[PDB]
């Protein structure tokens, strides 16, 4: 895991939390791609945004990202009760022999 | 609509071979690459191979280099991996995933379904 | 690298390709060939023939 | 003087099948690949399918791959395009154009007449 | 429509109009040719312009065109009546899986 | 030695057909391709057509093809051109070249004497 | 005609002289074979260069051909009173469907 | 034992014809192409011509090409080599080989014992 | 004879020899195979490696070869007073119409 | 039965309905002709469709098929209450040592 | 009716006029002579052209003929008053079981 | 022996045992087949695989096999008593005149 | 596992040549590129070569350059040191070694077990 | 050893070209750039022109730019100075040059033999 | 020798654009960056933009800049000048000039001919 991540991020229906994913100057800093997958919990990961800024047609307005220098975020507004899933980031780093590196992943609970 | 489905797993015990498969549907398979990726039970997502389009370049991991072995079959439709030398910290659960290339880094934008390797004894 | 097959390439034939016969192929029989005796063909074989007494 | 007429529209209710065809006249029909570009009523030109001159190759769009099917038979002159499962959102006029390259991107030479094809219920 | 056109464009006969199609560094600031097509009211699409510069035979001296940067131009001089047409930009973009994309196209009017 | 000899020029008016033969002799016909080369008079010269040593494939000019027509016969050794639709811009000498190929282009290396076409009414 | 030659070229017995060829970026520029061809006032064209620096049996010592970047040339040396002939270039253009692509043509003149 | 036997040799003044042959035993000739193969006095190797198994295509160097003709009898295991209007350059001994082919290009397993012809005046 | 070859090489019994067969991009360099063989003063040749490293039944362990790029060679160990011999390597050429070409032929001399 | 039949298909008197015939890469895919036959529920077969598009003089214009890559279809028009029979698919096969190979079987049930 | 001929052709006194036997890949496409019959108004069909190329002896050296791909044609110069009569094009079918194939015909007339 | 197999494999009955072909660029890695023969210690060969997947009607469901690349193995499932046998995997081999090529032979041995 | 086997060494003269090889196993040999380094009995290490991942650049050291050549062939997973001229000065155990690539320099990630090269006389 | 051998000098009267080559060997060619020096008779030495290992970049001296320019073909390891318009003060012995670099500034490390171009009339 | 030639000029009415062009000749154009300098009858000289050599910097005066464009073209050896929205203060004789640095501070060495511009109603 190159690329980390907080362990959980919480919050009650209704405000907007954000995931960061901080990388470093071989896969974010050195000018390559972000993209954000969700997996709930017994399915297969489902992408989210690719390119930083784009979504899939499936995926609703709600989900926003955005990266800065080294780091990257992923702002959820407007929590409901189906967005508890984990979310992973994915780049890739240029110190390896990978195509995509995968960041430690964060667990999204609902207050419900 | 595209299609991913696999199978292949099982149980099998540490030291000997096991073949996967995932069959493809609703896409033109000999224009795409595609990936296997794998998630340890509780923890995250783990990329293991890539293919070409035509099956002439290969990547894999540095935990699975020289014992995995990726393919294709464009004739039917079918991603294979050859897992030879199976060791304990090899069971996870097994995806394809097909290619797609944005900017400067690849994605998957289409993942298959799963299927789950135990290496035991 | 992009991993996916180039749909920004030439769709036409190349007319800068080699027009004559090759030289370097096999001479030799081929020793891989169907031995058999192939059951498709026409079995109403009178096709067309010289219906006179001599070629 | 390069032809090409097209034929195989009308109205569809929306799930099933139809068929189109471009016959072709007036050039080498082996030693060109063709395109299927459609334009809703009202609406801009979109790019759908192209199939390489030999038939080896082909790609489509996004919003098309899986239930669209191009195809040709050289000893014909004449170029189909297979529309399985159509939807409300198919019906455009279709044009077949002719395949030309120039330096690093393809253009359409000549066009045909172009058919109309509805779906609806 | 990756390829971004005015909706709209008129000029008086006789004078010069533009008609400009701006694009992203993936199609057209990545070096990939722009072919312009015409379309009559009635008819098909013809060709216009291909290689940013070059025209075909029966395309008059009239209509020219040139690109620089990300963005690429149509120039019409001397407007005619006859000239009442949709035209549409045509490039390759790097970032989908398709031979062509077309921009979203100008129907120029002559005040007549 | 290599004789290449044409024939079956002569004048004719706009419109209508006019077929050329060149045949040859002190080489193996068939393992090579032919070219037609066309030299207006007082201009420079044109490609004009080839065809492969088999005949699977033809390539023509553009301002030709789809009324020139060019064919061979193995087993009499002579070239054809036939051209249909005839045009005052059609009025040259005509030459048959034998094919050659280098390294990445191909070129003539033995040309036949030539032939006037004329076309005027 | 793709290639651009100078229409005339002339020059004193004895002495040297050169033919240029000017292409583009898609004929001699991309890699291409050049080919030169030698046509007398009242006979069919005779190959005289191939591969840019090879010559056939009848052809002397006299002429030589070389190629780099964009344009070519063809250098005699020594001129005589036969040599008076048009001098074409042939390559293959990549924008073209046709399988050689000629030079407007050069017709040289020994000052005799 | 593959034998080749080779006769036809002698002394012939320049500008008339001579005829090669090269008798063939322990072998399947049929399944086979033939070569010739020259060698000048004190001078290197030279290949001057290929037969196929069946007859059917024929390749000639061009320093040959229009004057020899090669060909076989299939019945009686013998292979000609028909040399016509003979310069002084033909002078040399010629060879009959085996063909063969490995991966992409072709070598002479088996070679005649070698006759040898001289013109002059 | 397309294919360079030096005219001679020496060397003493007991020795190593190697024999050179240089060609350019058409032949050798285009990834055809190059295959030797060796001539006795008064005898038609004998074939002596096919394919490169393959050898036929008689020749003994003696003698071997190989290719890289450009260059093939034969490397011939344990000189004994039977190989004087001429040593040619054959190929084929791309840009010629015959099926094989030779080289020039070196002869081999133990210094006895 | 390596060509590939569905079992039973309906339509209503009036409609359109089609019946498919799926083989493989060694008998309609490498290219050979596909032939329908037409059973009453109590006589022997008739022939339909040879040659892909071809029908006899019996056989009304309702009836028409044609194939495409490894797959072939059945096209009829305006169903009728004597349609009801089962229609066959006849190709030959490379691989086997018969002339004919022949399908599933298709029976078809007008809705009256 | 395998193959296709004009209804009727017309031209001046001593003019030449092309008669036209389009045939497909079965009949003349594949391989097989074609031969043509010049049948008088008030008599049996006369034999006027065979192998293509040959006529007997009682055809005039006017008539002509010649074949290419599945196309064949019937070439007539300087027509003369008695030349006004039908022609048919005849060949070989692989598809049947007939010996010969006859055209529509082509009715010629002479604009006396 | 072009194609490569170990000389012996064991297994215990009840357990999975794979046998593998090792073969080379020219007969395996060129598309060509592999069949698989049984032979038990005092009767003949009997085929066991043909077309890399496909078995006969007396071969049991047992035995399977695949090719990937360069190399082709039978997988053996469930092994019993009467699966004492030499087992020979067959190919075609470019490089030769012969129209079989054998492997050395996999003993296999039932660990009872 | 990663393993590196060299051959080829032994004793030779001043003044010829010897030829060197690392047959490789464990990793796809295709996609690394490979380095040669040597060390002379007693003192440090020295690099000398380096080829790319498709062969297409070569480096050499200054003291070595013009005399070795380094080369791979991609269907045997083998790396050769073509060695010409040696010198006494070229008496050392040489290594091959795989490259890797961190930042901005590059470094040896496994090495092979080492093959002596001894010039005298 | 580096061997820098040039050719192609001579006199020549003023106005016209001459180009002069410099052949290479005992190193990479296509690893170097290229240097071209000029020392009139009796005089100091002149830098000239340089060019890039790949010949993306060429310079010139202000006193021969326009008139000059420089190239290479790396299949054949030859450098080429092509002079036009050789005017008097042109006459000098030209060098070429392996380039170098050592902190901030260039030098030159090999350099060739040298040939007299001479224009007078 | 240096040559720069303008043209594109003429007369135009305010609130349009106009397009300028300075062909190069005798130099490297890649090489150099370039100027464009104008001159208001009767008044005095007014820079206008700089271009770099590959184009990636850009500057202009504060009384043209959000109007008019400066651009190049490498493979033509074409500078271009596109002003939009033309006013009478834009009323002057053009000039493009070849950019040079001695120091701290720029000159143009060489300069064109000038091309006049006239905006009036």
């Known amino acids: 895991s190159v690329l980390t991540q907080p362990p959980s991020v919480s919050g009650a229906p209704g405000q907007t939390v954000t995931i960061s994913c901080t990388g470093g100057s071989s896969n974010i800093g050195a000018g390559y791609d972000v993209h954000w997958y969700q997996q709930l919990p017994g399915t297969a990961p489902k992408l989210l945004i690719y390119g930083n800024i784009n979504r899939p047609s499936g995926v609703p307005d709600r989900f926003s990202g955005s990266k800065s220098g080294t780091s990257a975020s992923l702002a959820i507004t407007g929590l409901q009760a189906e967005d508890e899933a984990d979310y992973y980031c994915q780049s890739y780093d240029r110190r390896l022999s990978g195509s995509w590196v995968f960041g430690g992943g964060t667990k999204l609970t609902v207050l419900g | 609509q595209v299609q991913l489905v696999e199978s292949g797993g099982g149980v099998v015990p540490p030291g000997r071979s096991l073949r996967l498969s995932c069959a493809t549907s609703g896409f033109t398979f000999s224009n795409y690459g595609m990936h296997w990726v794998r998630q340890a039970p509780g923890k995250g997502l783990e990329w293991?191979?890539?293919?070409?389009?035509?099956?002439?370049?290969?990547?894999?991991?540095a935990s699975v280099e020289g014992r995995f072995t990726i393919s294709r079959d464009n004739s039917k439709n079918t991603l294979y991996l050859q897992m030879n030398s199976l060791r304990v910290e090899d069971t996870a659960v097994?995806?394809?995933?097909?290619?797609?290339?944005?900017?400067?880094?690849?994605?998957?934008?289409?993942?298959?379904?799963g299927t789950l390797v135990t290496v035991s004894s | 690298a992009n991993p996916n097959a180039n749909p920004n390439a030439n769709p036409n034939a190349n007319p800068n390709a080699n027009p004559n016969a090759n030289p370097n192929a096999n001479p030799n029989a081929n020793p891989n060939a169907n031995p058999n005796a192939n059951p498709n063909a026409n079995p109403n074989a009178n096709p067309n023939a010289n219906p006179n007494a001599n070629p | 003087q390069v032809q090409l007429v097209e034929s195989g529209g009308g109205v569809v209710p929306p799930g099933r099948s139809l068929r189109l065809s471009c016959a072709t006249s007036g050039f080498t029909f082996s030693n060109y690949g063709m395109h299927w570009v459609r334009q809703a009523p009202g609406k801009g030109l979109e790019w759908?399918?192209?199939?390489?001159?030999?038939?080896?190759?082909?790609?489509?769009?996004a919003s098309v791959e899986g239930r669209f099917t191009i195809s040709r038979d050289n000893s014909k002159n004449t170029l189909y395009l297979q529309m399985n499962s159509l939807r409300v959102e198919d019906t455009a006029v279709?044009?077949?154009?002719?395949?030309?390259?120039?330096?690093?991107?393809?253009?359409?030479?000549?066009?045909?007449?172009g058919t109309l094809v509805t779906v609806s219920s | 429509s990756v390829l971004t056109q005015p909706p709209s464009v008129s000029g008086a006969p006789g004078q010069t109009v533009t008609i400009s199609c701006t694009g992203g560094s993936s199609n057209i600031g990545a070096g990939y040719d722009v072919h312009w097509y015409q379309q009559l009211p009635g008819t098909a699409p013809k060709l216009l312009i291909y290689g940013n510069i070059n025209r075909p035979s029966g395309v008059p001296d009239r209509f020219s065109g040139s690109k620089s940067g990300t963005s690429a131009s149509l120039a019409i001089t001397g407007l005619q009546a006859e000239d009442e047409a949709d035209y549409y930009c045509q490039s390759y973009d790097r970032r989908l899986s398709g031979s062509w994309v077309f921009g979203g196209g100008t129907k120029l009017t002559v005040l007549g | 030695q290599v004789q290449l000899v044409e024939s079956g020029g002569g004048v004719v008016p706009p419109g209508r057909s006019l077929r050329l033969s060149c045949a040859t002799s002190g080489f193996t016909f068939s393992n090579y391709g032919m070219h037609w080369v066309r030299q207006a008079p007082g201009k420079g010269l044109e490609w004009?057509?080839?065809?492969?040593?088999?005949?699977?494939?033809?390539?023509?000019?553009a301002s030709v093809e789809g009324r020139f027509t060019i064919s061979r016969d193995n087993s009499k050794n002579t070239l054809y051109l036939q051209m249909n639709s005839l045009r005052v811009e059609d009025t040259a000498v005509?030459?048959?070249?034998?094919?050659?190929?280098?390294?990445?282009?191909?070129?003539?290396?033995?040309?036949?004497?030539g032939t006037l076409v004329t076309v005027s009414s | 005609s793709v290639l651009t030659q100078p229409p005339s070229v002339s020059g004193a017995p004895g002495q040297t002289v050169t033919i240029s060829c000017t292409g583009g970026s898609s004929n001699i520029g991309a890699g291409y074979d050049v080919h030169w061809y030698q046509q007398l006032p009242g006979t069919a064209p005779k190959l005289l260069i191939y591969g840019n620096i090879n010559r056939p049996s009848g052809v002397p010592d006299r002429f030589s051909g070389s190629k780099s970047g964009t344009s070519a040339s063809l250098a005699i040396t020594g001129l005589q009173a036969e040599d008076e002939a048009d001098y074409y270039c042939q390559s293959y253009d990549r924008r073209l469907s046709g399988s050689w692509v000629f030079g407007g043509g050069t017709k040289l003149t020994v000052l005799g | 034992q593959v034998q080749l036997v080779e006769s036809g040799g002698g002394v012939v003044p320049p500008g008339r014809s001579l005829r090669l042959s090269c008798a063939t035993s322990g072998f399947t000739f049929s399944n086979y192409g033939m070569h010739w193969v020259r060698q000048a006095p004190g001078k290197g190797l030279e290949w001057?011509?290929?037969?196929?198994?069946?007859?059917?295509?024929?390749?000639?160097?061009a320093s040959v090409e229009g004057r020899f003709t090669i060909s076989r009898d299939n019945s009686k295991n013998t292979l000609y080599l028909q040399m016509n209007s003979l310069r002084v350059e033909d002078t040399a001994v010629?060879?009959?080989?085996?063909?063969?082919?490995?991966?992409?290009?072709?070598?002479?397993?088996?070679?005649?014992?070698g006759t040898l012809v001289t013109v002059s005046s | 004879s397309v294919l360079t070859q030096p005219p001679s090489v020496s060397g003493a019994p007991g020795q190593t020899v190697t024999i050179s067969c240089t060609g350019g991009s058409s032949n050798i360099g285009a990834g055809y195979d190059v295959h030797w063989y060796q001539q006795l003063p008064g005898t038609a040749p004998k074939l002596l490696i096919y394919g490169n490293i393959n050898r036929p039944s008689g020749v003994p362990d003696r003698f071997s070869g190989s290719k890289s790029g450009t260059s093939a060679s034969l490397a011939i160990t344990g000189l004994q007073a039977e190989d004087e011999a001429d040593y040619y390597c054959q190929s084929y050429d791309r840009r010629l119409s015959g099926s094989w070409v030779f080289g020039g032929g070196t002869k081999l001399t133990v210094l006895g | 039965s390596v060509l590939t039949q569905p079992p039973s298909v309906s339509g209503a008197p009036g409609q359109t309905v089609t019946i498919s015939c799926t083989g493989g890469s060694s008998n309609i895919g490498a290219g050979y002709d596909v032939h329908w036959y037409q059973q009453l529920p109590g006589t022997a077969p008739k022939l339909l469709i040879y040659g892909n598009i071809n029908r006899p003089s019996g056989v009304p214009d309702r009836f028409s098929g044609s194939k495409s890559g490894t797959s072939a279809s059945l096209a009829i028009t305006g169903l009728q209450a004597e349609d009801e029979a089962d229609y066959y698919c006849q190709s030959y096969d490379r691989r086997l040592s018969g002339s004919w190979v022949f399908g599933g079987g298709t029976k078809l049930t007008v809705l009256g | 009716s395998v193959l296709t001929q004009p209804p009727s052709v017309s031209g001046a006194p001593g003019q030449t006029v092309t008669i036209s036997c389009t045939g497909g890949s079965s009949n003349i496409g594949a391989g097989y002579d074609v031969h043509w019959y010049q049948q008088l108004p008030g008599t049996a069909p006369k034999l006027l052209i065979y192998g293509n190329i040959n006529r007997p002896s009682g055809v005039p050296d006017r008539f002509s003929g010649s074949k290419s791909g599945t196309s064949a044609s019937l070439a007539i110069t300087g027509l003369q008053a008695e030349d006004e009569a039908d022609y048919y094009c005849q060949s070989y079918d692989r598809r049947l079981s007939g010996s010969w194939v006859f055209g529509g015909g082509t009715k010629l007339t002479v604009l006396g | 022996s072009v194609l490569t197999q170990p000389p012996s494999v064991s297994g215990a009955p009840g357990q999975t045992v794979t046998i593998s072909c090792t073969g080379g660029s020219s007969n395996i890695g060129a598309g060509y087949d592999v069949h698989w023969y049984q032979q038990l210690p005092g009767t003949a060969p009997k085929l066991l695989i043909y077309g890399n997947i496909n078995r006969p009607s007396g071969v049991p469901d047992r035995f399977s096999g695949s090719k990937s690349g360069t190399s082709a193995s039978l997988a053996i499932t469930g092994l019993q008593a009467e699966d004492e046998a030499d087992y020979y995997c067959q190919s075609y081999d470019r490089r030769l005149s012969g129209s079989w090529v054998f492997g050395g032979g996999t003993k296999l041995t039932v660990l009872g | 596992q990663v393993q590196l086997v060299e051959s080829g060494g032994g004793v030779v003269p001043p003044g010829r040549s010897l030829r060197l090889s690392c047959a490789t196993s464990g990793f796809t040999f295709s996609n690394y590129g490979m380095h040669w380094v040597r060390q002379a009995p007693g003192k440090g290490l020295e690099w000398?070569?380096?080829?790319?991942?498709?062969?297409?650049?070569?480096?050499?050291?200054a003291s070595v350059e013009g005399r070795f050549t380094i080369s791979r062939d991609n269907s045997k997973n083998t790396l050769y040191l073509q060695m010409n001229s040696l010198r006494v000065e070229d008496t050392a155990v040489?290594?091959?070694?795989?490259?890797?690539?961190?930042?901005?320099?590059?470094?040896?990630?496994?090495?092979?077990?080492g093959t002596l090269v001894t010039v005298s006389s | 050893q580096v061997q820098l051998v040039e050719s192609g000098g001579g006199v020549v009267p003023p106005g016209r070209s001459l180009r002069l080559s410099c052949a290479t060997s005992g190193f990479t060619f296509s690893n170097y750039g290229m240097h071209w020096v000029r020392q009139a008779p009796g005089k100091g030495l002149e830098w000239v022109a340089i060019?890039?290992?790949?010949?993306?970049?060429?310079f010139y001296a202000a006193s021969v730019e326009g008139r000059f320019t420089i190239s290479r073909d790396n299949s054949k390891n030859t450098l080429y100075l092509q002079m036009n318009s050789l005017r008097v003060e042109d006459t000098a012995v030209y060098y070429c040059?392996?380039?170098?670099?050592?902190?901030?500034?260039?030098?030159?490390?090999?350099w060739g033999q040298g040939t007299l171009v001479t224009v007078s009339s | 020798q240096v040559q720069l030639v303008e043209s594109g000029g003429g007369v135009v009415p305010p609130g349009r654009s106009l397009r300028l062009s300075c062909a190069t000749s005798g130099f490297t154009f890649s090489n150099y960056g370039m100027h464009w300098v104008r001159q208001a009858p009767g008044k005095g000289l007014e820079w206008?933009?700089?271009?770099?050599?590959?184009?990636?910097?850009?500057?202009?005066?504060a009384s043209v800049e959000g109007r008019f464009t400066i651009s190049r073209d490498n493979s033509k050896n074409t500078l271009y000048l596109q002003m939009n929205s033309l006013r009478v203060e834009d009323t002057a004789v053009?000039?493009?000039?070849?950019?040079?640095?001695?120091?701290?501070?720029?000159?143009?060495?060489?300069?064109?001919?000038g091309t006049l511009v006239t905006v009036s109603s």
């Open positions: 040059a392996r380039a170098a670099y050592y902190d901030t500034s260039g030098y030159g490390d090999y």
């Open positions: 060019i890039w290992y790949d010949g993306s970049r060429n």
